[PDB]
Design a protein around this ligand. Sequence first.
Ligand SMILES: [Zn+2]
Lengths: 9, 735
Amino acid sequence: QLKDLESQI
Amino acid sequence: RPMNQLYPIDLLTELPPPITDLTLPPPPLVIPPERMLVPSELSNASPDYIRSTLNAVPKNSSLLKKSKLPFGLVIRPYQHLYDDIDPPPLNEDGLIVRCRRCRSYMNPFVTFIEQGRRWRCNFCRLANDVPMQMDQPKSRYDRNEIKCAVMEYMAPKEYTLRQPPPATYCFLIDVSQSSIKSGLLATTINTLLQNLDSIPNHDERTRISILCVDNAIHYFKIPLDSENINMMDIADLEEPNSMVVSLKACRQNIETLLTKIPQIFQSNLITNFALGPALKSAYHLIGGVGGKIIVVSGTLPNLGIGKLQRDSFYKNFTIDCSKVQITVDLFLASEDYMDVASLSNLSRFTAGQTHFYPGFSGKNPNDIVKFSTEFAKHISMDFCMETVMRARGSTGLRMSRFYGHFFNRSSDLCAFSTMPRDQSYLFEVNVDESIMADYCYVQVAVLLSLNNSQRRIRIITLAMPTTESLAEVYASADQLAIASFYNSKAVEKALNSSLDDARVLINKSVQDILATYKKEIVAGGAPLRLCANLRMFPLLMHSLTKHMAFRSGIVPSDHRASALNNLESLPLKYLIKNIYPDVYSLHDMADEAGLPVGTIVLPQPINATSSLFERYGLYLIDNGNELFLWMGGDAVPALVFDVFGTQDIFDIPIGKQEIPVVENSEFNQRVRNIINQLRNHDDVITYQSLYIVRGAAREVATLRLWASSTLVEDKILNNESYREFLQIMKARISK
Ligand SMILES: [Zn+2]
């Protein structure tokens, strides 16, 4: 879950 | 460097308080021009978008802890209900320069290094390569992201997973009997009918839906206007196209439908309102794309899942809404118990809002005005979809807590199924490792899907000087942002622990700061020391303990939950006014006041105390929730005449009523002008009802009681006056 579209990682 | 200087004052010498201070800007963010790529006033984040409690950040943990001042951020992505008003610069070429390691965005504080071939990240010092694009007649220095602290970009494809959605609305309307009798259904149908063109439809894609609900869920199939009613009932509480339709392609039809609805349930005798089941229907109805579920009700849920009594279903519902990008807004209007404490969680954790209208009744023409006005502004308000917001701090800074209406579980990311325009948020910042630079930074990033089918990224970059001087930390403290901080901590302590505990917390915030300023900083007799920039802090907190949200004593559960819900999401500017009201002395009003400059000039606000209320004067109280027009009992017949028409003050309108239009009375015009001006804001939906009170039967006593309790500087019931509050504090920080 700890991953989103804003981070871009 | 010109670090803000400490201006010591004696609180005891400033009574009554210089409340004009509440309208002053926070301490300056001292940043030399060299630290900015293109120096200007737009180069550093504006207080309207972000306000740190500390504009001179402690260089280390032990200093932060010693100051006893909190470190938080009052963040507010949007400034108006409509995005056409004052938008930030908008980037469109698609170039988004970001640091490889921390992911921060190019900003006014990065340092270009090595002939300008690379850039050193101001947040983590990593060396990054400058894309050849940056310099493709303009230079990189002409770019908004280098010129502005607050700006926006058109997000490239990789910031999206599915094509931006259309603005989707599903109105869940209570058509049970309580709603018919109160006039809520009529008022709601009317307002929608009167505002179908107020609802945003920038891309002509906006879709709407209508759910009427009593003991069963009533649907409506709406055909395209181009092919010229279908009501599908569903009593099976245990159990898309043409139900959610184009507001444009079905304009006449939607209009035709809203018009019959009042007739359809005109004589409904059912008292059941299956909110639970209905909320689930709406979910399934718009879940494949996400959107807004706007609930209008004047009936406590009493059937199907989620029913309540004089629940956790809702909290789980919000968890589900976060999966499909759904937000729930609520308009609760009734004379009966609504359990705002429980239902407000629906909006709270879905980034929406709950609006509560105590004693709503169509029998009072003025009740309609308030509800329609606010419901209209609310539906006309712009918003984002599938939005997420996060703040990145420079090395040593960490975002530990997040307050406001949105969804956040175990990350630094705040999810907004939809991002409204009328709320505010707050982030707590913890300083872990010691800052080494003379500056630290915070950058807010908002990845959103605008209601115009566009994907964007709004960035807010703030730069703050670091310091090791406790004097300097206090000198740059933002009294209002700090007031906001403790307001949120208080709501949490209240909405979770005890009401008394919240009061205890509020008072301690003042005691600790007063005790700290006293011992940590160094002729007279017995002053209560503090600095000019914090001069309003004691007043605000003390005033906050008297607010309906934290009052000791008795306050109806709904009125309390509501007050708490409001204080936690109100924009700074209105939070302060909701805590400490603007009071106007009209009878001796300057001649410019009440007249244009089409914006009306307002009189200067006076202290919120009955001490200044002459028995022959006229005063107007604005607390952000209502307006109270108080006319002294010994007012001259001329005054009584100039305002209402008669000369018999006992013949004056009493209660929730508007001021009459008195022909040939220029004063009467200026009064109606000031009241109308106090009612227009392009940033909130609030429509304040006017209460007229006469001073010096049981209704008149109630009004005076209510109006009088707004003057928070006075001894009220079992709470001491501000004057005594300060004395109490002084006695406590003593040996
Ligand atoms: Zn970096």
